[PDB]
Amino acid sequence: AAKKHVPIVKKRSKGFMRHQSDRFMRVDSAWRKPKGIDNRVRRRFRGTLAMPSIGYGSNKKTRHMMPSGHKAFLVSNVKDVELLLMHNKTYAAEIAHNVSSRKRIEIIARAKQLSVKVTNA
RNA sequence: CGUGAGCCCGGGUCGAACGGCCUCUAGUGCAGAUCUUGGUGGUAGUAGCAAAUACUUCAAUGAGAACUUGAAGGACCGAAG
Numbered sequence: 207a208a209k210k211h212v213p214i215v216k217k218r219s220k221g222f223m224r225h226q227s228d229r230f231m232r233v234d235s236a237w238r239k240p241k242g243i244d245n246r247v248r249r250r251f252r253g254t255l256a257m258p259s260i261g262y263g264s265n266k267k268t269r270h271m272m273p274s275g276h277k278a279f280l281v282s283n284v285k286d287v288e289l290l291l292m293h294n295k296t297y298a299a300e301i302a303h304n305v306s307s308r309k310r311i312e313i314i315a316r317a318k319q320l321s322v323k324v325t326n327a
Numbered sequence: 328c329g330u331g332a333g334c335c336c337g338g339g340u341c342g343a344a345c346g347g348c349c350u351c352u353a354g355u356g357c358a359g360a361u362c363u364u365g366g367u368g369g370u371a372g373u374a375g376c377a378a379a380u381a382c383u384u385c386a387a388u389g390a391g392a393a394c395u396u397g398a399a400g401g402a403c404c405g406a407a408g
């Protein structure tokens with residue numbers, strides 16, 4: 207599986223956290239752009255957090271590829287996993303939650319016949 | 328996984344509903360407003376519990392007695408009490 211691709215180079219493997227999200231408990235860790243008039247992060251002072259922008263974008267050839275080389279497709283049926291019959295070299299099944307224990311077995315059983323990778327077997 | 332808002336999965340709890348996609352709709356996104364309501368801290372076992380002179384012994388009750396009771400002693404209000 208995972209036919210062939212250029213090496214998956216990630217320009218930044220960390221992520222962006224909100225300014226002062228570590229000091230205050232009311233401030234979530236999800237990124238929000240600092241819009242204050244005196245904010246040091248927004249003014250890009252040396253030694254502060256970085257802001258998300260294009261330029262950190264991933265290569266288009268490897269944009270949504272997991273490290274194996276597949277792209278994740280959410281599957282919740284035996285009929286849904288059969289959509290990847292022709293794309294088993296580029297897409298990998300990912301059994302969503304809410305799928306009962308019995309239906310999970312059938313999806314694993316069928317995706318094995320199709321030689322489709324399952325990311326949460 | 329995505330530059331990002333976010334999305335997805337595994338593990339634990341739980342017990343009755345829920346989601347994707349295309350359109351339509353809105354009381355639709357919070358860190359502040361000496362914001363509103365509710366809850367909780369440090370301070371902190373901290374400030375303090377110091378006016379009106381004052382209590383002590385024995386016994387009983389009782390799981391437990393300085394401020395319950397009886398007896399004895401010592402005091403105060405001192406009749407515009």
Ligand SMILES: [Mg+2]
Nearest residue numbers: 341342343344
């Ligand atoms: Mg019920």
Ligand SMILES: [Mg+2]
Nearest residue numbers: 353354355356
């Ligand atoms: Mg509103």
Ligand SMILES: [Mg+2]
Nearest residue numbers: 232356357358
């Ligand atoms: Mg809110």
Ligand SMILES: [Mg+2]
Nearest residue numbers: 232357358359
């Ligand atoms: Mg708030």
Ligand SMILES: [Mg+2]
Nearest residue numbers: 359360361362
């Ligand atoms: Mg306030």
Ligand SMILES: [Mg+2]
Nearest residue numbers: 372373374375
């Ligand atoms: Mg004290």
Ligand SMILES: [Mg+2]
Nearest residue numbers: 375376377378
């Ligand atoms: Mg005092």
Ligand SMILES: [Mg+2]
Nearest residue numbers: 405406407408
């Ligand atoms: Mg008189």
